[PDB]
Amino acid sequence: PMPPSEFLDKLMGKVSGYDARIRPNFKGPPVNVTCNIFINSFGSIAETTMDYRVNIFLRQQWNDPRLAYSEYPDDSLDLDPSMLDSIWKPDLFFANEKGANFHEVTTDNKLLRISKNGNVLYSIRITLVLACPMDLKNFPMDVQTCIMQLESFGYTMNDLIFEWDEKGAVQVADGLTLPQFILKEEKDLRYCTKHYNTGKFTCIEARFHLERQMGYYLIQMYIPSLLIVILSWVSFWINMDAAPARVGLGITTVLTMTTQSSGSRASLPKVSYVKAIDIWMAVCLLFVFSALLEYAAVNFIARQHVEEMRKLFISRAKRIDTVSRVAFPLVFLIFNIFYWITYKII
Amino acid sequence: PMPPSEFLDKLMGKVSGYDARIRPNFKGPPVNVTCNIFINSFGSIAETTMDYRVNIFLRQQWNDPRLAYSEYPDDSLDLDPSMLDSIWKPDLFFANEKGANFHEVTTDNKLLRISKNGNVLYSIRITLVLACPMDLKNFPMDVQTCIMQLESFGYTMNDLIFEWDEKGAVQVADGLTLPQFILKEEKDLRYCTKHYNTGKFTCIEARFHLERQMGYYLIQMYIPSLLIVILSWVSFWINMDAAPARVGLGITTVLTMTTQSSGSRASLPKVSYVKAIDIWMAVCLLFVFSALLEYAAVNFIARQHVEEMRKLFISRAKRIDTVSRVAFPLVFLIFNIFYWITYKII
Amino acid sequence: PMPPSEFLDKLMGKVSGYDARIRPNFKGPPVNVTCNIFINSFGSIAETTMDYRVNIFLRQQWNDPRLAYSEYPDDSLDLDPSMLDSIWKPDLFFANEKGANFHEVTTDNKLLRISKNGNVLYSIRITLVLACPMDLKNFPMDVQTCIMQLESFGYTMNDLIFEWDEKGAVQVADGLTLPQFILKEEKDLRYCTKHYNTGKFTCIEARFHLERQMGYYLIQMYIPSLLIVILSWVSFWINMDAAPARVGLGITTVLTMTTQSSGSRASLPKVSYVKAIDIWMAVCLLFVFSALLEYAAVNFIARQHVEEMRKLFISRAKRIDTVSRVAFPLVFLIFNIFYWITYKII
Amino acid sequence: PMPPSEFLDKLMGKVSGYDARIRPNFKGPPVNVTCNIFINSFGSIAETTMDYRVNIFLRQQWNDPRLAYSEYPDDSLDLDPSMLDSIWKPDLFFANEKGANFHEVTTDNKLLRISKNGNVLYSIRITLVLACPMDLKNFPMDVQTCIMQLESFGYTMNDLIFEWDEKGAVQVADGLTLPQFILKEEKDLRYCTKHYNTGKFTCIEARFHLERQMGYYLIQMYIPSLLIVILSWVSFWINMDAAPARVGLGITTVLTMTTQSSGSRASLPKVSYVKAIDIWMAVCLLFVFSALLEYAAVNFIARQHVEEMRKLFISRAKRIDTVSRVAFPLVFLIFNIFYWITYKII
Amino acid sequence: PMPPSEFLDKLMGKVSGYDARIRPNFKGPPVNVTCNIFINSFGSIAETTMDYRVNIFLRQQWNDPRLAYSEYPDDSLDLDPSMLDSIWKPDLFFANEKGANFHEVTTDNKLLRISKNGNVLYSIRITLVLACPMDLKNFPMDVQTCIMQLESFGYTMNDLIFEWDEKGAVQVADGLTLPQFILKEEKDLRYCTKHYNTGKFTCIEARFHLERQMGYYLIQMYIPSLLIVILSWVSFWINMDAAPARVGLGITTVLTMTTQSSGSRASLPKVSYVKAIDIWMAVCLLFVFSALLEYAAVNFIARQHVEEMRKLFISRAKRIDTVSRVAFPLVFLIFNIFYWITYKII
Ligand SMILES: *[C@@H]1O[C@H](CO)[C@@H](O[C@@H]2O[C@H](CO)[C@@H](O[C@@H]3O[C@H](CO)[C@@H](O)[C@H](O)[C@@H]3O)[C@H](O)[C@H]2NC(C)=O)[C@H](O)[C@H]1NC(C)=O
Ligand SMILES: *[C@@H]1O[C@H](CO)[C@@H](O[C@@H]2O[C@H](CO)[C@@H](O[C@@H]3O[C@H](CO)[C@@H](O)[C@H](O)[C@@H]3O)[C@H](O)[C@H]2NC(C)=O)[C@H](O)[C@H]1NC(C)=O
Ligand SMILES: *[C@@H]1O[C@H](CO)[C@@H](O[C@@H]2O[C@H](CO)[C@@H](O[C@@H]3O[C@H](CO)[C@@H](O)[C@H](O)[C@@H]3O)[C@H](O)[C@H]2NC(C)=O)[C@H](O)[C@H]1NC(C)=O
Ligand SMILES: *[C@@H]1O[C@H](CO)[C@@H](O[C@@H]2O[C@H](CO)[C@@H](O[C@@H]3O[C@H](CO)[C@@H](O)[C@H](O)[C@@H]3O)[C@H](O)[C@H]2NC(C)=O)[C@H](O)[C@H]1NC(C)=O
Ligand SMILES: *[C@@H]1O[C@H](CO)[C@@H](O[C@@H]2O[C@H](CO)[C@@H](O[C@@H]3O[C@H](CO)[C@@H](O)[C@H](O)[C@@H]3O)[C@H](O)[C@H]2NC(C)=O)[C@H](O)[C@H]1NC(C)=O
C-alpha cells in the first residue's frame, strides 16, 4: 500500500477533479460546519479599551464528499500543515476581532484529519483580543457579559451554515482562574445572523458571564473611606477650644477624601453615568464635609455669648454637639443598609 | 457545465488577453469606483497622539467589461481570496493612515463577486488608526470632527474617480457605543481632490461628528472644585482668634486647588491656548486665594486697635467679614451664569 | 567523494522515497523524541499579566531510520537551515505560549545534524512569554512556581512521545541572575499528558521555583510603615495642652498611613484575598489610628474636671497616658513576633 | 498597438538585455538621483526617547537610458507596483531610521512612471521614526532642530549621487499643525557626505526648525509657582502671635514647592545640565524658603525681650517685618526682569 | 566583456560547482571571519528590563577561494541584495539578542562586495535590544559595563572562528551622545568561547563602559533632601511655646521625607540590596526624625517644672536646645564627608 501522503495526492491532485476553491455539495444544500472551542487562557480584561484576550483551540467539522475514500485501510488520514492550502476550508472570522494572530512555533499549530466517509476535523490555535462593551453602572458588583461571535465572510446562508455541536460546545481548561473575575459555568449559546446589503451571513455566538471579585475593592477603597468618616466623628469629643485642631481635623480629612474620590477612578473608562463606587465616595464625602459645617454651627453659636442669654448660649452649644455624637453614627448606618441591600437585589 | 473556478480561469487566464495590470476602459473614460464603509468598531480616541482607531468593511464597486460573461448560467461568481492577484483592483489608500493592517484569521477576510454585465463587488476588512487634529478650545463641551479620506495613489483623475454611493454611503453597526463620545447620525460627505506636482488624484471623505459626554468631567472635576471654594466660605463664620485655623483653612484649600488644577490636564496634549476647563480651575483658584487675602485684611485691620479709635477698629473688622459672607457667594454665582451660558451658546 | 549537500539530496530527494510528511517508524512503534532546554535569559516576571519571558535553546533528539547512511566517511552531516523544510520534525508547541517567536538575525538560528545510525539533533532558539498563575497569599515571602510544558499538536500518544533526557534536562547559563527572584537549583520534571476529545497528546513539563528577595520590600514598605507607628508614640510625651499638635500628630500620621496602604498595591493584580503585606499595613493602620482615639479618651476624661473629683479627673488623665507609653510599644512587639514567625513557618 | 504592460515586458524582459541589478550608465558617470519629500503627518515628538515620527511621500527621479522608447505613442507609462522588482532602483535609506515601514493597505503604496527619454519618477509612502538629539538647555524657550538624512547604502560617490531638486525640495501639507511646536517655513538643505572605511557614500539632509509653544508651560508651571511665592508674602501681615500659622504657612508652601519642582521634570530626559525651568523653580524655591527664615529672625529677635532694651526688642521686630513687605516683592521682580530678558536674547 | 551580474552567475551558477550550503575550505582549516561594528545610535538604557537598544553596521570579512576570478578586469564586484541567498555567509548571532530586526526601507540594507583573491566584505544594518545585568550598588555613581557578544550558531570551533580586526574593531559615530551616560573611549575586546553539550562555538565580545551623569540626580534628589533637613534645623530657634508649630514642623517635614524616600525608586528595578541613594535618603530620614524626638525631650523636660528645682528645669531645657543648634549641623556635615569620599574612592 502506498503511504497516505502519496494517497492524499491522489484524492486532491490534478487528477480526480478536486478543486480547493469550490465548496462541498456545490449547487446543492449548504455546508453544515459544526464548531466548538477550547479556552486555554483567558483574561487581561481591560476596561479603558473594553477588550479581553482569549487563547482558544478552534475546532471545525464538516463533510466533504469528494474526500471519501474506500481503498486505504485505516480509518483516518492526517495532513501535514504544509498541505493545508489544498483542501476547502470555511472562511470563519470573528466579528469583534480587534486584532488576532495564529501560532507558528516549531510548526504551524494546525490539525487536520479526514475520516472514511469524508468527515473533516480541522483544529487551529488562535489568540484573540475580543471587544466587549462594559456596563459599569454598579461597578464593584456588576456581572459583565462579554461575547465572541463566529461568522462567515464570503459565503452566504444558502451556501454555508455554522452550528454549535451538542457535545459540549465550549470547553474550558482544568485550572483556568482569573485574578479579578470568576467565569460562571453556564455559557449561553445563540444565533447572531447578520444582514448586510451584500447578503445574509451565518453567525453563532457564545456568551461568557464574568462576575467580579468584590474582595479587592472592599480592601482598597470601601474600608479606607469608612475610616476617614470615623475620623470626622472623633472631632466631636474634642471641646470647642482647640479650634486649630477641630478645623484642622475638618480639613485634612475632607481633602484626603477628595484624593480617595479622585483616586477611585484612576484606571477606568470616562463614562458619563454615575456608578456604585461614585455614590459611595460622594456620600462619604458628604459626611466628612458635614462634620466641618457642624463645627461652624458650634463656633458661631457660642460666639454670640444681660446675664442669662450669655449663659444660655454656652449650654446650647453643648447640646448640638451631643446630637452629632449619635445622629452621624446613625444616619451613616442607615446609608450602609440602603447601599448594600440596593446592590444585592440587583 | 464546468465549475466557476475553471470558468474564471477562462475569463482571466493567458487566453482571452486579460491582464490584471491594465485598468478597465483603457485609453477611454475613467473608471468610476463607488465606495461605502461599514463601521464595526470605533473608539480608543486618544488626544495625546490625536488619533482614533476604526474597524471597517470597505466595499468597492466598479465595472470591468472584460469580465462580462454570457455562457455560465448563474448571475454571480465568487472568487477564492487566493485568486485576488489576478483581477484589476483600485489602489485605494487612506491619506491619514498612521498605520493600518488587514485581517487574516482562518482565511483572508476578502470578498469578491462578479455579475454578468461585469459589475465587480470587492469587500475587505481593515483596521485603521486614523489621524484627526483636535480643537480643544472648549474642552468638556466641544464637538470634535474627525475625518477619513480615501484616495487613489497611482491613477490620476483622468483614469480613476472615487464616488460615494447614494444608498447609504456610511453604515454603522447596531449597538455601536462609545465610552466618552456620542456619534451623531448626520455624517458629512464631500470631495477632497488633491493636487500634487505628480498630478491630480481623486479623493472622497467622510466627516464624523463626535460630541463628548460632559457627565464624566462634571463628576471628577467640576464638583470637587466647587466644594473647595465652599471650604473657603466656612472660614468666615470662624472668629478672628483661631488664626492657626483660618490661615490653615486658607492654605490647605489653596494648595489642594493647585493639585486639582495640575491634575486637570494629566492626560491631555500640551496645547498653547487656554481651554474651558482651565478658566474654571484658574477662576476657582482665585476664589480660594482671595479668601486668604480677605483674612489678611482682617488680621491687620484689627491689629491697629485714645479710646474710641481702638474700639472703632474692632467693629470695622466685624463689618468686612459680613460682606464676604454675601459677596463671595454672589460673585461666584455670577461666574456660574457667565460660564455655562458662554459654553452653551457655542 | 561528493560533498554532503549533494549527499543529503540523495538521502532526501525524490529518489529513495523519503517523504517529510511521514514520521519515522510509520505504522509501528511511536517516535521517542527526547528534549532538553538551555535558558539564556529569564525574567521580566510581571504579575498584572501573570507571565514571564524566557529565552531558550530547545534541543530535540529522535531517530529516523530513513536517514541512516553507510557510504559517506564522516560521522555527522550538518544541514543548511535553508533545507529544514525537507526532513520530518516534531510538531512541538508550548501549552502556555501567550505569544512567541523565532530569531532570524543574520541566519535562521536553527541547528540540525544527522549521525550515521539516524540520530537527528535539532536545536533552535525561541523567545517565549509563558503564562503562570501567581499565588500571592503571602506576598513578599512567597515561593512562586512557574512552569513550561511541551506538547505535541497533531500526533497522538500512539505516534509520538516526548521525554526529558536524563543527562541534565534543564541547563541554566553561567551568570543568570534575577533582580527580584532567585531561581532554585532543583527543577521538578514530570508528565502532563493531556486528554482532549480529539485524542490523548504527549506532554512533559518543567517546574521553576522562584523565591522572592524580601530585601526590597523590607526597605520601601516595612521600615517606613514601622516609623509612622513610632510617630504615634511620640504623641504621648506631649502634654494635654497642645491639642492642635497631638491631634495634628494624630491626623497627619493616620492619613499618610492611608497613602502607604494604598501605595502598597500600586503595581499588583487586583486579587480577591488578603495578602501578607495587607495584614501588615492594616494592623499598622490600627496602631496609628488607636493613638488618636487614645487622645480623645484623654481630652474628654479631663474635660469633666465639689473639690476632690475635679482634682481626681486631672490625675486620672495622667495615668491613662502612662499605660500607653508601655502598652502600645508592647502590643506592637507581640504583633512583630506573631507576624514574622507566622510567615517563616510557611 | 500592444498595451503598455505587454510593452514594458519588451523593454525589461529577457530580450533587449535589461538587467535590474546593474545601474544606468554603467562604467560611466554616476547616476544623478534627485529627491523631494512631502510631509503628510508630523509629530509625537518624544524627548525621553529623543525621536519624532514623520509620514512622508518620498519622490525620486533619475535617468535610465535603457528605458528610453520611441515606438509607443503616449508620453508616460505606469508600472504596476507588482512589477517593481524588475527595474533598477536606488538603495536609499535613512541614517537615523530607528525603525520604519512601508504602507500596504489595499495595494502597495508605490508609484512608478517612465517618460520617453528615460526619466523615471518613483514615489513611495514611508512612516519614519527619526532620531534627533534634543538641546534642552533653555527648555520652554528652545528652538529644536531635528533633521532627516538620505543616504546610499551600497553605491559609493563615484556611482550614485543624491541631490535635492530646486523646485521646492520639501513640501508640507495644507493644514499640518503641531500640538506643542510650530514648524518654521525656512528649511535648511545641505550635504552630509559620509566617509567610512568601506568608501564614501552620498548623503543629503533637511533641517526642520521646531520652536515650542510657551503657552502651555506658562499656565501649568510658571503661574502656579508664581502664586506660591505670593503665599509667602501674606505671612508678613500676620502678627508674631500666630506662630502655628506663620510657621504653618512657612512649611505648607515650602513643601508644596518641592512637589512643583519635582513635578516639573516628570516626563523629561534625565539630563546632566541645569535648564531654564530648573532655575525658575529653584529660585522660587528660595523665596518660599527665605520667608520661613525671615520669621525665625523675628521669633528669635523678640524672644530676647532693664526696661528700655526689653522695649527696644519689641519695636526691632516691627521693623524687620516692614522691610520684607517691600524687599521680597522687589527682589522677586528684579529676578522677573533678569530671567525673561535672559531667555529672550537667546 | 559581459556585465558583472552575468559574470557572478558564472561564478555561482549551477556550473563551476559552487554551493552556498558548503563553507570555504571544506574539510580543511577553519574559516577566519573578522568583524567590526559601527554604532549609529545607542541608548534607551532601561533598568526595569535591564536592556539597551543599539543600532549598528555589522561588517564581516572572510575568504572564499571559490569566488576568486581572474578574467574580469575590475578589482571588486558588488552583488545585488536580491542575490544574497546564493553565497555562503556566516551564521553569526548575538548571545544576548532579546529581540532584533533588520532594516528594509526602499531596499534591503545589505552590502556585499567580492575582491579578486576572494575576499568578501559583507555589511548589514541591525537594530539590537541587548541584555546587560545592572550592578546598582552605588547607584548615581556607578560605572555600568554592558556587553555585546557575537557567536556562531551551527559551526563549531574547528569550522569557523570569529576575530576582531586590529584596525579599529568598534567605531562610534561623530556626535553620538547619551542623555544619562557617557560612553568611555576605551572599549575592551576579549573572547567568550562557549562550551555546550553540542560542541564548542566561537564567540567574541565588546565591553562598553557607561558612566552616569550625576548632575541630574544631584538636582532632583540630593538637594531637595538637603533642604528638608535644614527645615528641621529652623525648629530650634522657635521657643517652646509654639507646640502646634514645632510639632507641625516635626511632622510635615518627616512625612514629606517619606515621599522623597519612596519617590527615589519610582522607576528602578526591585533590587534586594541597599544602594547609595538609599543610604542618603534613610540617613536624611534620621535627621528629620531625630529633630522631632529632640522636641519631645524638651517639652517633657520642662513639663516637670520647692522653688529651685522648678527654676532648674526651665534653664535645663534652654541648654538642650543650644547643643542641637550646633550638633545637628555638625553631625550632618561629618556624614557629608563620609558619604562623598566613600563613593569617590570607588
Ligand atoms: C444542512 O443542515 C440543514 C438543516 O439546517 C439541512 O437543510 C434541510 O434539509 C432537509 C433534507 O434533510 C430539507 O428537506 C426537508 O425534508 C423534510 C423531511 O425530513 C421535509 O418534510 C421538508 O418538507 C423538507 O423537504 C430541508 O428543506 C432543508 N432546510 C433548509 C432550511 O435548507 C441541509 O440539508 C443540510 N445539508 C447537508 C449537506 O447536510
Ligand atoms: C464615469 O463617470 C463620469 C461622470 O463623472 C463620466 O464622465 C462623463 O461621461 C459623459 C458621457 O456619458 C461625457 O459626455 C457628455 O455627455 C453629455 C450627454 O449626456 C453631453 O451633453 C456632454 O457635452 C458630454 O459630451 C462627459 O464628458 C464625461 N465627463 C467627464 C468629466 O469625463 C464617465 O463617462 C464615466 N465612465 C464610465 C466608464 O462609466
Ligand atoms: C519508544 O519508547 C517506548 C517506551 O516508552 C517503547 O515502547 C515499548 O517497546 C517495547 C519493545 O522494546 C514493547 O515491547 C515490550 O517488550 C518487553 C521486553 O523488553 C516485553 O516483556 C513486553 O511484554 C513488551 O512486549 C513495549 O510494549 C512498548 N511499550 C509501549 C507502551 O509502547 C517503543 O518501542 C520505543 N519506540 C522506538 C521506535 O524506539
Ligand atoms: C551627474 O551630475 C554630475 C555633476 O554633479 C556630472 O558630473 C560632471 O559632468 C561633466 C560633464 O557634463 C564632467 O566634465 C566637465 O565638463 C566641463 C564642461 O562642462 C569641463 O570644463 C570640465 O573640465 C569637465 O570635463 C565633470 O567632470 C563631472 N564632474 C564630476 C565631479 O563627476 C555627471 O556627468 C552627471 N551624470 C549624468 C549621468 O548625468
Ligand atoms: C585561520 O586562522 C588560524 C589561526 O587562528 C589558522 O590556524 C593555524 O594555521 C597554521 C598554518 O598557518 C597551522 O600550522 C602551524 O604552522 C606553524 C608555522 O607557521 C607551525 O610551526 C605549527 O607547528 C603549525 O603546524 C596551525 O596549526 C593552525 N592552528 C590552529 C589552532 O588551527 C588557520 O590556518 C587559518 N585558516 C585559514 C583558512 O586562513
Tab-separated table of N, CA and C in Angstrom, chain B residues 56-107:
chain	number	residue	atom	x	y	z
B	56	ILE	N	-13.368	48.780	9.843
B	56	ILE	CA	-14.387	48.965	8.823
B	56	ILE	C	-14.439	47.765	7.892
B	57	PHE	N	-15.557	47.659	7.179
B	57	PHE	CA	-15.682	46.850	5.972
B	57	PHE	C	-15.679	47.816	4.798
B	58	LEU	N	-14.647	47.769	3.971
B	58	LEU	CA	-14.534	48.677	2.838
B	58	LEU	C	-15.064	47.990	1.588
B	59	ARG	N	-16.191	48.465	1.072
B	59	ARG	CA	-16.811	47.890	-0.114
B	59	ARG	C	-16.507	48.784	-1.307
B	60	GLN	N	-16.083	48.186	-2.413
B	60	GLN	CA	-15.801	48.924	-3.634
B	60	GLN	C	-16.538	48.266	-4.783
B	61	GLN	N	-17.105	49.076	-5.670
B	61	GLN	CA	-17.837	48.570	-6.821
B	61	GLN	C	-17.373	49.312	-8.061
B	62	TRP	N	-17.015	48.574	-9.103
B	62	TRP	CA	-16.667	49.177	-10.377
B	62	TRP	C	-17.187	48.278	-11.483
B	63	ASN	N	-16.899	48.647	-12.723
B	63	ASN	CA	-17.337	47.885	-13.881
B	63	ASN	C	-16.121	47.501	-14.701
B	64	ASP	N	-16.016	46.219	-15.031
B	64	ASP	CA	-14.897	45.689	-15.804
B	64	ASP	C	-15.496	44.960	-16.998
B	65	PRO	N	-15.499	45.575	-18.187
B	65	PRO	CA	-16.159	44.946	-19.342
B	65	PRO	C	-15.462	43.701	-19.852
B	66	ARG	N	-14.219	43.460	-19.453
B	66	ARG	CA	-13.517	42.243	-19.818
B	66	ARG	C	-13.963	41.044	-19.000
B	67	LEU	N	-14.680	41.265	-17.902
B	67	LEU	CA	-15.193	40.194	-17.063
B	67	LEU	C	-16.662	39.908	-17.313
B	68	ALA	N	-17.226	40.426	-18.397
B	68	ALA	CA	-18.613	40.142	-18.728
B	68	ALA	C	-18.702	38.806	-19.446
B	69	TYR	N	-19.536	37.916	-18.926
B	69	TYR	CA	-19.727	36.592	-19.491
B	69	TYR	C	-21.173	36.437	-19.941
B	70	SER	N	-21.417	35.429	-20.773
B	70	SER	CA	-22.766	35.170	-21.253
B	70	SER	C	-23.131	33.695	-21.318
B	71	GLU	N	-22.225	32.785	-20.975
B	71	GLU	CA	-22.467	31.359	-21.150
B	71	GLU	C	-22.782	30.638	-19.850
B	72	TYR	N	-22.132	31.021	-18.759
B	72	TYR	CA	-22.398	30.401	-17.471
B	72	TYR	C	-23.789	30.810	-16.983
B	73	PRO	N	-24.557	29.887	-16.391
B	73	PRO	CA	-25.979	30.189	-16.144
B	73	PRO	C	-26.252	31.103	-14.959
B	74	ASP	N	-25.499	30.996	-13.866
B	74	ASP	CA	-25.836	31.776	-12.684
B	74	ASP	C	-25.393	33.229	-12.843
B	75	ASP	N	-25.948	34.091	-11.992
B	75	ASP	CA	-25.798	35.531	-12.149
B	75	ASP	C	-24.574	36.106	-11.453
B	76	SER	N	-23.908	35.349	-10.583
B	76	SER	CA	-22.756	35.852	-9.852
B	76	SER	C	-21.742	34.735	-9.666
B	77	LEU	N	-20.469	35.114	-9.628
B	77	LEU	CA	-19.372	34.177	-9.427
B	77	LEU	C	-18.450	34.704	-8.346
B	78	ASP	N	-18.207	33.895	-7.323
B	78	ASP	CA	-17.310	34.274	-6.244
B	78	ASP	C	-15.892	33.819	-6.556
B	79	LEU	N	-14.922	34.691	-6.309
B	79	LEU	CA	-13.528	34.274	-6.323
B	79	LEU	C	-13.109	33.747	-4.961
B	80	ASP	N	-12.205	32.783	-4.988
B	80	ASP	CA	-11.396	32.493	-3.820
B	80	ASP	C	-10.549	33.727	-3.517
B	81	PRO	N	-10.390	34.113	-2.247
B	81	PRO	CA	-9.379	35.128	-1.915
B	81	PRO	C	-7.935	34.725	-2.218
B	82	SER	N	-7.659	33.457	-2.536
B	82	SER	CA	-6.354	33.081	-3.057
B	82	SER	C	-6.110	33.633	-4.453
B	83	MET	N	-7.167	33.911	-5.215
B	83	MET	CA	-7.051	34.330	-6.603
B	83	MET	C	-7.273	35.825	-6.791
B	84	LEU	N	-7.110	36.625	-5.736
B	84	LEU	CA	-7.275	38.071	-5.850
B	84	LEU	C	-6.100	38.770	-6.515
B	85	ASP	N	-5.006	38.069	-6.789
B	85	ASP	CA	-3.892	38.675	-7.503
B	85	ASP	C	-4.093	38.682	-9.011
B	86	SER	N	-5.263	38.272	-9.497
B	86	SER	CA	-5.478	38.048	-10.918
B	86	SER	C	-6.535	38.957	-11.529
B	87	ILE	N	-7.115	39.880	-10.767
B	87	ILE	CA	-8.007	40.885	-11.327
B	87	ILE	C	-7.345	42.245	-11.187
B	88	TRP	N	-7.957	43.237	-11.817
B	88	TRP	CA	-7.607	44.616	-11.542
B	88	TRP	C	-8.347	45.084	-10.300
B	89	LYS	N	-7.645	45.796	-9.430
B	89	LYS	CA	-8.246	46.397	-8.252
B	89	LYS	C	-7.788	47.840	-8.132
B	90	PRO	N	-8.640	48.722	-7.614
B	90	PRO	CA	-8.217	50.105	-7.404
B	90	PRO	C	-7.197	50.200	-6.288
B	91	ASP	N	-6.235	51.096	-6.464
B	91	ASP	CA	-5.189	51.308	-5.467
B	91	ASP	C	-5.614	52.370	-4.454
B	92	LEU	N	-6.706	52.070	-3.763
B	92	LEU	CA	-7.220	52.963	-2.740
B	92	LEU	C	-6.304	52.946	-1.528
B	93	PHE	N	-6.076	54.115	-0.943
B	93	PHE	CA	-5.389	54.199	0.335
B	93	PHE	C	-6.037	55.315	1.133
B	94	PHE	N	-5.582	55.489	2.361
B	94	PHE	CA	-6.144	56.471	3.270
B	94	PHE	C	-5.097	57.544	3.508
B	95	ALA	N	-5.463	58.805	3.279
B	95	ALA	CA	-4.470	59.870	3.319
B	95	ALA	C	-3.997	60.193	4.724
B	96	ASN	N	-4.687	59.703	5.738
B	96	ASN	CA	-4.297	59.839	7.126
B	96	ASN	C	-4.270	58.473	7.793
B	97	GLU	N	-3.554	57.530	7.162
B	97	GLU	CA	-3.439	56.157	7.659
B	97	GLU	C	-2.893	56.093	9.073
B	98	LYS	N	-1.645	56.531	9.266
B	98	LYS	CA	-0.882	56.367	10.509
B	98	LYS	C	-0.894	54.903	10.968
B	99	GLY	N	-0.625	54.006	10.030
B	99	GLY	CA	-0.606	52.595	10.355
B	99	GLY	C	-1.949	51.908	10.231
B	100	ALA	N	-1.973	50.793	9.508
B	100	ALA	CA	-3.185	50.020	9.282
B	100	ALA	C	-2.786	48.606	8.894
B	101	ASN	N	-3.752	47.693	8.962
B	101	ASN	CA	-3.480	46.299	8.648
B	101	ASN	C	-4.743	45.609	8.160
B	102	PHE	N	-4.555	44.467	7.512
B	102	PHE	CA	-5.670	43.622	7.125
B	102	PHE	C	-6.003	42.668	8.264
B	103	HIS	N	-6.862	41.698	7.983
B	103	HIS	CA	-7.232	40.668	8.941
B	103	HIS	C	-7.191	39.338	8.219
B	104	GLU	N	-6.415	38.395	8.740
B	104	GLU	CA	-6.117	37.157	8.034
B	104	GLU	C	-6.338	35.948	8.923
B	105	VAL	N	-7.423	35.925	9.687
B	105	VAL	CA	-7.651	34.867	10.665
B	105	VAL	C	-8.641	33.867	10.090
B	106	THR	N	-8.120	32.660	9.858
B	106	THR	CA	-8.638	31.410	9.312
B	106	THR	C	-8.784	31.493	7.784
B	107	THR	N	-8.729	32.684	7.190
B	107	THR	CA	-8.841	32.995	5.768
B	107	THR	C	-8.596	34.493	5.672
